Design a binder for this molecule. Structure first.
Ligand code: NDP
Ligand code: ZMP
Ligand code: DCQ
Ligand code: SF4
Ligand code: SF4
Ligand code: SF4
Ligand code: SF4
Ligand code: SF4
Ligand code: K
Ligand code: ZN
Lengths: 48, 95, 43, 360, 340, 156, 176, 114, 41, 208, 291
């Protein structure tokens, strides 16, 4: 890359990171979607 | 343009964030929630609207066989720009 | 066009047979060496 | 230590491959075949590809047939290095293992360059191959094949004329010819016993009738003649690789029936029909016409067969995998009679078993 | 009730049992089988560990993916305790030592840390807290273990009033220090006993009974604020208890009386080690403390746990201590001990 | 304190002696064992790291589960792991040993060897390359390097 | 078209009999094997110094997965699910909806790396070159669930390895 | 309705084969407890054998009970020869499984299965 | 002869190895699948 | 139709048709169908009482000499009352040829074991017991060959699901690998892939 | 068709249209097959779709910003053979190879429309019609097709009881069934009744009827009033569509009384229009002059 540099982008990491597994910077998986079924909110008033 | 819930947890570009009363935040305790801070929906608004002089334009996103299939975009509406379905680059007939 | 192809004259000849080159002495020479070493040690 | 009965319990690697094939399409069922005989990968790919193409009533292009035979003989070199060197490792000569796995590492580099994966390529596909040879590959295959004969020579120097290697393999595991045909043996297991049979000659496939080579015939049916048959098949595989490198034709590498093989990505992004065919071949896949075939090839372990039953859909109805190692390990119990543990390990060596194809 | 914690599935490994448990001290004898029986229901088990993570390896296959969250904790640090309990809907307390170490005494392990865990769990909103006392806990007991554990029972009851406090008698299992302890005095000599071990009575309880009792106390809303006494079905004198231990293992059982003033000098002889001690004078006092009878407290029969006797699981515990010449003898090839 | 320094240097000594003398066992299952043999081959060469096979579980330090774990061999895997003396480690090689892999929905396959044994290093691939396996082994050595056995003994 | 391996009869003149008897009594082929082993003793070994020296790879190599972007910041994945329709192990799970500007994008793009068979059908089925299987192979984890990549991890793999993935696609894309 | 038998002409020879197979299991169970060193009593294993026999007690087809005798002899050969392990013998004792909800009320409480 | 007379009902539930929960408490639906109205075939 | 279409071998088609007539008229006691496929493979569909008479013919007859048993296979087709289709693949090394002998059974009818003809079948039909449930009468050592030892059910039957009914895990309570009912963390996503448009008019069945 | 393109030219791009919140329109994909126009002219009876233009610039549309809002306006999503008319709520969400097709019944009206509920990984994706020659021939109303996203909002998931302060709080099933049965044991006679709703199956209906019969209560009501003067609900003939839905194809005169069948039972109105179009039906209406 001193002779043929890589094609620069605005999103390519300027800070490359090594393997983070076992550290507090490691990947923890999670569902990337929102709540499917919306639940009913009961009213906050007395029914009398 | 990542934002943050009142729990301190970052919100993904989907809109996913765990609730305050949701126990599944315990997977991020002592660790990190990995989010990508380069939102595509924020970075496609930064693109300039391409002013052209043709009525039907074509987009393959660049690269030819390195982009997406070449679609043809109509620019008859003077109200709305013409958005590519794949790349999101939007066009306008300049008249 | 450009394509992964053999050259115009083809590739060179490739060895594929057994080559166990038959080295060493004969039998009588090795027994002569051994019996001579015996005689030197005995003397 | 005299062996009185062998009961090989198998199915410890029974993965249930050929039921998983029934719920996946033909292109999705292709990488199951890489993992059956996992030292003979592109030979299993070629057998499954020939079965599907025989049912599809289409043929590969000629260049893809030559690439299939070239990498099939590279694959045969891989499997016979594995067979000879681990047979000797299980006897005790542990050093030509380390000598020949550098050559095997270089052929895995050839796989990694042509397909992107060192072992399981999913490269030989129904319709041809997936991708053309990269530039500079065949010259490196020539530079490998120029020097591989010296490696076979020094393996054969270490073992063939050695008296300790002969005393472990000369009177061991003799198989008669009629009991070899009766036990359903194939390949070297027949050819060690003198049965002149090779499917690259008798029932030839893609361009094996266009390459000239020899078939090594054993004389005593023992482990040692099967050793010499595997070493001479390495010699003949170098011979066929010389003939395939000289005779490589130009052209495409997929069948140009674009309802079977996918179009190029340069034309998928431009043409409408090519985009529709890309979409429908990578989601539904091509529909194989109804019917059943049994397509068997000469894999480096013997007759490797696929009995493929299609019901007209885009998925297989049934796919039986005939492995040579299944019948060879069945005949283990006869071959081990009158021998000891240090001889039964040589018998399991000369029956070169990969248990992924034995168990599926 | 939150939507992510509603119980789904058929109660298997990959199901959702709706139980989020912070099990303090899960790296021990009870915590092993507790995380086992939780993670097979499909529970989110938070394991705060003090030890090496290698010593937590056996807790990893016990549940599905992401269901056991290991995290560091210190008993002299409320920050890590609040870091552990803030998402759970049940906290279980299994912190214990049979001996007092250089930095910890029985008061740190049984009074300080349990009151800290119960106070932090109260002020983090945890609904259910299970504390594990001992059946013979008493203020005027001769052993410092049982004194500090009675004081800790009092403090957990006063700082978390809805806590389920459980009294096990003497728990036996494969990794116990009760039947293994009784086994390992064929090494030292002739298994010495205070007053021939016939003035103390025990009713030992099996560990899966205690584990099913803890989980049925989690699932029972009527177990909030109770005080359970988990005992095995049969009461034994200590003499024929040890005789049944040495009869299952087929070892030469030749007991002898050692007096009380001299069998504590043997206790201080083995607690001068910097390692885990082989015995101590506290263990002398607690092997020779009779299991008291508390009929007013509910037991395993009130949580639906059928108590397993010793004559079913003693072979499972004590097959390890046999020599090869009697290694393969069966469960029925022994006369049972005499009950009282 | 002095004793913390002494137990820290003795932790460093025993972690050095355990990560620099890893003895795996001759134990493969499927295609990954061919690549694990290539990690033993002269190009990548495990033996320069002190990594050398011992066929018996009693004299092995790590078990590389290299291949597919079926149901018929899972008790054999568990008894082989049990017959390893502590400290023993598990490196999971390939997709079938990690999470079931290409045979995940099969009737006969244990979906990951972590249902059977406690697993330290998960090596991903089908197969992972011998270089990727050696990367996983060196990551296991780094995991052994940061063990705190005698420090945690000194503090408990 | 066939050859008889091991069908040699030995010579029975006194010269060859004495030669084989010297071979038997004086161990000639054993010294041949020792000579070949001693010949390899004096060679340069093929041991590359990992981790400082790396095994040679190609621009077709199939390693860690990554989601690519267009050269404007916009992600390429338009939720068309061919990569999970062709995936031979069902490692890819996609859930989608029109996002806030009406664009066809994914909300869930999960790849289970412990089901994934690394065959690269997803990168050859993708019509927009979104999912690729990049060059990283040194990504071993210490826990199983770190090998269950969501959309965020795959986009971070793309943002991490883009300066190499773009060059490898530039090197190979004419073959595809 | 004219079918081909496997071993039995009718139910009498079939019940004879079931009876001989139960005799063989009853003779085998003490050895199975001993050399697998199972931690169950011999009566408990014999009651498990009686339960596994009474599970199939409703069949009236001679071919089906011929196959049940065949599969029982196969499991018996896997038990006499040490081809099963301690796990395969204790899998008849569903011990790690929870007691499933039996009445309508608890099945209603836990889920949706009838 | 070499044939037997079985008048009994054909039932192989004890041979297929299916547990009881998936024999007696399942409801098989036998039907011609309706045409997808997204398509004309 | 030259480059992309498989060429047709009419000589082998005619030869296999003549040999199929030959076999059908020598053995009409058991031979039900004879059919030659378009890529020239021969199928002799027989009756399951003629396993030993036909296969000993093809093993021994001087115009057949099918001395090699390549493969032995069952195929489950549940819509037939004899749902299993036992397939014998044979190789004649003398005449360089292959033949297929197909027969049928249900779950309860025994098929006579062909170990007296080809010893290679000693495992193959053993596998057919293991995978399909077909009992083979007068087999020397018939037991399971591929499944686990306590495995109930027959895997390659189509009424048996893809994942089974059980799954194994280690349990540290009992210190033992245990079988539990199977629960997948992700269900196998069943894909409906069949097109509603006919692909091959030559394979069109007549309607009712 | 063939497998490749000879078209080496530039394609057209047709301008998109906006005919409602139900039908996403991408007219570039339109192949000008006029199933739009024949459906809206012959079944929907709208006559507001057409082709404007001549030649390759012939555009299917409405020629103006006119919103195609019928009660059957989404069925053009079914019979568009290309993707020019897609379901806007279903748009971009799922894909038909992974959707599980469960054949079920409508409950949005009393037509009883046969449908396919197609789901994906335990979540309802869309609702398509089934073919049934006697009910809904292969169509459904727009409510049936597009009301499935009310099925995932405002849902009742946990048993709620009134707390001590008078608010609905979450509780277990045991507490809820105990607090209901404790009041049910103190009721007898006409002290307990039951209002049946609109969406309640016959199993729950006979369940609650037998339950209140155990209390000896016959006071069981529904929301929709049917008069009981005369034979009442005893005979089935005086409250059914006794001819049939299909019997409109056999009739020649239809007298509609006091109803708007376009919005009460839309596919019954579609069957009346099919008889009106093909069989020359004579329709008379007593009521408000609706369209
Ligand atoms: N037979 C018995 O043992 C009986 C025990 N009990 C009680 O049950 C509980 C658990 O018993 P058991 O498993 O047998 O005992 P263990 O000593 O084996 O287990 C104690 C657990 O707590 C942890 N721990 C111990 N001391 C400390 C400390 N100072 N700080 C932090 N963590 C600590 C240990 O992990 P680490 O590796 O970090 O030390 C381990 O996980 C205790 O409260 C005990 O009093 C009650 C009746 C009988
Ligand atoms: C340690 C654990 C080992 C587990 C052992 C597993 C054994 C499993 C073998 C199962 C084999 C069978 O169930 S075959 C039985 C089926 N028989 C029938 O349906 C015919 C009816 N038979 C009977 O009722 C039998 O009780 C009798 C004794 C033959 C007749 O009694 P009825 O008259 O009164
Ligand atoms: C000493 C040289 C390295 C040997 C490393 C062997 C580690 C275990 C691999 C298992 C295995 C063995 C033993 C083996 O011999 C073999 O045969 C070639 C295999 O492939 C089918 C194997 O998978
Ligand atoms: S993860 Fe894949 S390549 Fe590796 S051993 Fe398993 S089946 Fe073979
Ligand atoms: S490489 Fe293959 S197995 Fe892996 S995600 Fe892509 S298609 Fe699926
Ligand atoms: S094939 Fe490509 S664009 Fe389509 S869903 Fe997959 S990654 Fe996204
Ligand atoms: S139904 Fe579709 S293709 Fe036909 S005219 Fe309407 S929009 Fe065009
Ligand atoms: S799926 Fe059909 S309507 Fe959609 S772009 Fe392709 S050919 Fe056109
Ligand atoms: K449409
Ligand atoms: Zn574009």
């Amino acid at each position: 890359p001193t002779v043929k540099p890589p094609t620069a982008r605005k999103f390519i990491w300027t800070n490359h990171k090594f393997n983070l597994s076992g550290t507090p910077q490691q990947y923890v998986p999670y569902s990337t979607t929102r709540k499917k079924i919306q639940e009913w909110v009961p009213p906050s008033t007395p029914y009398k | 343009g990542v934002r943050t819930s009142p729990t301190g947890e970052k919100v993904t570009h989907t809109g996913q964030v765990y609730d305050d009363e949701d126990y599944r935040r315990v997977r991020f305790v002592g660790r990190q929630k990995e989010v990508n801070e380069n939102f595509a929906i924020d970075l496609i608004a930064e693109q300039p609207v391409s002013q052209v002089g043709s009525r039907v334009i074509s987009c393959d996103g660049g690269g030819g066989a390195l982009g997406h299939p070449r679609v043809y975009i109509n620019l008859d509406k003077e109200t709305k720009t013409g958005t590519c379905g794949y790349c999101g680059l939007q066009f306008r007939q300049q008249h | 066009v450009k394509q992964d192809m053999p050259p115009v004259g083809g590739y060179g000849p490739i060895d594929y047979k057994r080559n166990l080159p038959r080295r060493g002495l004969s039998g009588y020479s090795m027994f002569a060496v051994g019996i001579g070493a015996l005689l030197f040690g005995y003397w | 230590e005299m062996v009185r009965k062998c009961d090989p319990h198998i199915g410890l690697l029974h993965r249930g491959t050929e039921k998983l094939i029934e719920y996946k399409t033909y292109l999705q069922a292709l990488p199951y075949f890489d993992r059956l005989d996992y030292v003979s990968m592109m030979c299993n790919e070629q057998a499954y590809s020939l079965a599907v193409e025989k049912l599809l009533n289409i043929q590969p292009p000629p260049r893809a047939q030559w690439i299939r035979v070239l990498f099939g003989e590279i694959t045969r070199l891989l499997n016979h290095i594995m067979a000879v060197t681990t047979h000797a490792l299980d006897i005790g000569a542990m050093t030509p293992f380390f000598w020949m796995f550098e050559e095997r590492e270089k052929m895995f580099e050839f796989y990694e360059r042509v397909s992107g994966a060192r072992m399981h390529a999913a490269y030989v596909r129904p319709g041809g191959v997936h991708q053309d040879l990269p530039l500079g590959l065949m010259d490196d295959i020539y530079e490998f094949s120029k020097n591989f004969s010296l490696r076979i020579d020094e393996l054969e120097e270490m073992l063939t004329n050695n008296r300790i290697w002969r005393n472990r393999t000369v009177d061991i595991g003799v198989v008669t010819a009629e009991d070899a045909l009766n036990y359903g043996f194939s390949g070297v297991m027949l050819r060690g016993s003198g049965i002149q049979w090779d499917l690259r000659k008798t029932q030839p496939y893609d361009v094996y009738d266009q390459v000239e080579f020899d078939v090594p015939i054993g004389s005593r049916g023992d482990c040692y003649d099967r050793y010499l048959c595997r070493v001479e098949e390495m010699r003949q595989s170098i011979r066929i690789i010389s003939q395939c490198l000289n005779k490589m034709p130009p052209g495409e590498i997929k069948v140009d029936d674009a309802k079977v093989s996918p179009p190029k990505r340069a034309e998928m992004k431009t043409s409408m029909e090519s985009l529709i065919h890309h979409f429908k071949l990578y989601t539904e896949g091509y529909q194989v016409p109804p019917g059943a075939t049994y397509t068997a090839i000469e894999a480096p372990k013997g007759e490797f067969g696929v009995y493929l039953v299609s019901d007209g859909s885009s998925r297989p109805y049934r796919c039986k995998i005939k492995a040579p190692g299944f019948a060879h390990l069945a005949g283990l119990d006869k071959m081990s009679k009158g021998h000891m543990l240090a001889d039964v390990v040589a018998i399991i060596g000369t029956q070169d078993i990969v248990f992924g194809e034995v168990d599926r | 009730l939150h939507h992510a914690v509603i119980p789904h599935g058929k109660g298997g490994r990959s199901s959702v049992s709706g139980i989020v448990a912070t099990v303090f001290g899960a790296t021990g004898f009870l915590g092993r089988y507790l995380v086992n029986h939780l993670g097979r229901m499909g529970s989110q088990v938070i394991v705060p560990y003090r030890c090496e993570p290698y010593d937590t390896m056996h807790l990893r296959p016990m549940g599905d993916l992401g269901q056991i969250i290991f995290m560091d904790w210190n008993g002299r640090d409320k920050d890590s305790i609040r870091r552990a309990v803030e998402h759970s809907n049940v906290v279980i307390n299994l912190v214990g030592r049979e001996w007092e170490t250089k930095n910890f005494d029985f008061e740190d392990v049984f009074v300080k840390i349990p009151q800290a865990i119960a106070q932090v769990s109260k002020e983090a909103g945890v609904e259910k807290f299970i504390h594990i006392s001992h059946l013979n806990a008493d203020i005027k007991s001769s052993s410092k273990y049982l004194r500090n554990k009675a004081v800790g029972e009092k403090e957990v009851r006063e700082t978390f009033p809805e806590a389920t406090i459980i009294k096990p008698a003497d728990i036996f299992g494969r990794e116990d220090r009760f039947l293994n302890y009784f086994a390992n005095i064929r090494w030292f000599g002739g298994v010495p006993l205070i007053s021939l071990g016939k003035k103390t009575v025990k009713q030992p309880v099996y560990i899966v009974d205690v584990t099913k009792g803890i989980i049925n106390a989690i699932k029972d809303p009527d177990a909030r604020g109770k005080t359970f006494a988990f005992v095995g079905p049969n009461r034994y004198l200590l003499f024929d208890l040890v005789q049944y231990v040495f009869a299952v293992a087929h070892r030469p059982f030749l007991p002898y009386p050692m007096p009380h003033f001299a069998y504590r000098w043997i206790g201080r002889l083995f607690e001068i080690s910097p390692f885990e001690p082989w015995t101590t004078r506290d263990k002398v006092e607690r092997i020779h403390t009779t299991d008291r009878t508390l009929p007013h407290l509910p037991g395993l029969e009130d949580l639906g746990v059928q108590a397993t006797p010793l004559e079913l699981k003693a072979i499972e515990v004590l097959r390890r201590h046999r020599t090869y010449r009697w290694l393969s003898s069966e469960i029925e090839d022994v006369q049972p001990a005499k009950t009282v | 304190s002095r004793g913390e320094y002494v137990v820290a240097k003795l932790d460093d000594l025993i972690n050095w002696a355990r990560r620099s003398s890893l003895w795996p066992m001759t134990f493969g299952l499927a295609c990954c064992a061919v690549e694990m043999m290539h990690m033993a081959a002269p190009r990548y060469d495990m033996d320069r790291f002190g990594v050398v096979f011992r066929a018996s579980p009693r004299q092995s330090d790590v078990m590389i589960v290299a291949g597919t774990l079926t149901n018929k061999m899972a008790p054999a895997l568990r008894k082989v792991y049990d017959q390893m003396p502590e400290p023993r480690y598990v490196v999971s090689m390939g997709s079938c040993a990690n999470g079931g892999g290409y045979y995940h929905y099969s009737y006969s396959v244990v979906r990951g060897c972590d249902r059977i044994v406690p697993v330290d290093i998960y090596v991903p691939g089908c197969p992972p390359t011998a270089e990727a396996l050696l990367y996983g082994i060196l990551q296991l050595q780094k995991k052994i390097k940061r063990e705190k056995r005698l420090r945690i003994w000194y503090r408990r | 078209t066939y050859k008889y391996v091991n069908l040699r009869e030995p010579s029975m003149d006194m010269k060859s009999v004495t030669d084989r008897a010297a071979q038997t009594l004086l161990w000639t082929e054993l010294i041949r094997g020792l000579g070949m082993t001693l010949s390899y003793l004096f060679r340069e070994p093929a041991t590359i110094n990992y981790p400082f020296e790396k095994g040679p790879l190609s621009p077709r190599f199939r390693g860690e997965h990554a989601l690519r972007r267009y050269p404007s910041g916009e992600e390429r994945c338009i939720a068309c699910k061919l990569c999970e329709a062709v995936c031979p192990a069902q490692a890819i799970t996609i859930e989608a909806e029109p996002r806030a500007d009406g664009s066809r994008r994914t909300t869930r793009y999960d790849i289970d790396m412990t089901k994934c068979i690394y065959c690269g059908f997803c990168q050859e089925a993708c019509p927009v070159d979104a999912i690729v299987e990049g060059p990283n192979f040194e990504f071993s984890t210490e826990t199983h669930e770190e090998l269950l990549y969501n959309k965020e991890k795959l986009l971070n793999n793309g943002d991490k390895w883009e300066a190499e993935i773009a060059a490898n696609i530039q090197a190979d894309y004419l073959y595809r | 309705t004219s079918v081909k038998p496997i071993f039995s002409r009718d139910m009498n020879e079939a019940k004879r084969r079931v009876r001989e197979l139960y005799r063989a299991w009853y003779r085998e169970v003490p050895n199975t407890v001993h050399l697998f060193q199972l931690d169950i009593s011999v009566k408990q294993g014999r009651d498990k054998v009686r339960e596994m026999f009474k599970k199939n007690a409703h069949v009236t087809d001679p071919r089906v009970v011929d196959l049940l005798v065949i599969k029982g002899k196969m499991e018996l050969e896997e038990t006499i020869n040490v081809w099963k392990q301690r796990t395969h013998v204790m899998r008849f004792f569903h011990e790690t499984e929870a007691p499933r909800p039996k009445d309508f009320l608890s099945k209603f409480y836990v889920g949706h299965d009838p | 002869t070499q044939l037997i007379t079985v008048d009994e009902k054909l039932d192989i539930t004890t041979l297929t190895g299916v547990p009881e929960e998936h024999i007696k408490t399942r409801k098989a639906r036998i039907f011609v699948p309706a045409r997808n109205n997204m398509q004309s075939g | 139709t030259r480059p992309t279409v498989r060429p047709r071998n009419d000589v082998a088609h005619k030869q296999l048709s003549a040999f199929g007539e030959y076999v059908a008229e020598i053995l009409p006691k058991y031979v039900q169908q004879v059919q030659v496929s378009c890529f020239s493979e021969l199928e002799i569909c027989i009756h399951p009482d003629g396993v030993i008479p036909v296969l000993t013919f093809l093993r021994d007859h001087s115009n057949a000499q099918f001395k090699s048993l390549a493969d032995l296979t069952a195929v489950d087709i549940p819509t037939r009352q004899n749902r299993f289709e036992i397939v014998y693949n044979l190789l004649s090394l003398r005449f360089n040829s292959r033949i297929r002998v197909k027969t049928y059974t249900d779950e309860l009818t025994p098929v006579e074991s062909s170990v007296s003809v080809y010893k290679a079948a000693n495992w193959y039909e053993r596998e057919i017991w293991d995978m399909f449930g077909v009992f083979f009468a007068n087999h020397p050592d018939l037991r399971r060959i591929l499944t686990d030892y306590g495995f109930e059910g027959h895997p390659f039957r189509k009424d048996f699901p893809l994942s089974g009914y059980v799954e194994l895990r280690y349990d540290d309570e009992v210190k033992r690998v245990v079988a539990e009912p199977v629960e997948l963390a992700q269900e196998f996503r069943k894909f409906d892939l069949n097109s509603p448009w006919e692909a091959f008019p030559a394979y069109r069945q007549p309607p009712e | 068709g063939s497998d490749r393109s000879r078209f080496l030219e530039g394609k057209r791009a047709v301008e998109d249209k906006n005919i409602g919140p139900l039908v996403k329109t991408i007219m570039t994909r339109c192949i000008q097959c006029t199933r739009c126009i024949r459906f809206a002219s012959e079944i929907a009876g709208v006559d507001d779709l057409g082709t404007t233009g001549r030649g390759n610039d012939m555009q299917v549309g409405t020629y103006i910003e006119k919103m195609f809002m019928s009660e059957l306006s989404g069925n053009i999503i079914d019979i568009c053979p290309v993707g020019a008319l897609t379901s806007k709520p279903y748009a971009f969400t799922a894909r038909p190879w992974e959707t599980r097709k469960t054949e079920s019944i409508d409950v949005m009206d009393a037509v009883g429309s046969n449908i396919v509920v197609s789901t994906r990984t335990g979540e309802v994706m869309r609702i398509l019609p089934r073919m049934h020659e006697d009910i809904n021939e292969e169509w459904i109303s727009d409510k049936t097709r597009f009301a499935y996203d009310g099925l995932k909002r405002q849902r009742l998931t946990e048993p709620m009881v009134r707390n001590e302060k008078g608010l609905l709080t979450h509780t277990t099933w045991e507490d809820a069934l105990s607090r209901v049965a404790g009041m049910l044991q103190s009721c007898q006679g006409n002290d307990v009744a039951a209002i049946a709703g609109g969406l309640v199956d016959a199993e729950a209906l006979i369940a609650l009827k037998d339950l209140l019969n155990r209390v000896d209560s016959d006071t069981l009501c529904t929301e929709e009033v049917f008069p009981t003067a005369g034979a009442g609900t005893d005979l089935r003939s005086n409250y059914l569509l006794n001819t049939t839905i299909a019997g409109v194809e056999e009739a020649d005169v239809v007298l509609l009384v006091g109803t708007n069948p376009r919005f009460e039972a839309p596919l019954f109105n579609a069957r009346i229009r099919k008889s009106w179009l093909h069989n020359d039906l004579k329709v008379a209406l007593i009521g408000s002059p609706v369209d």
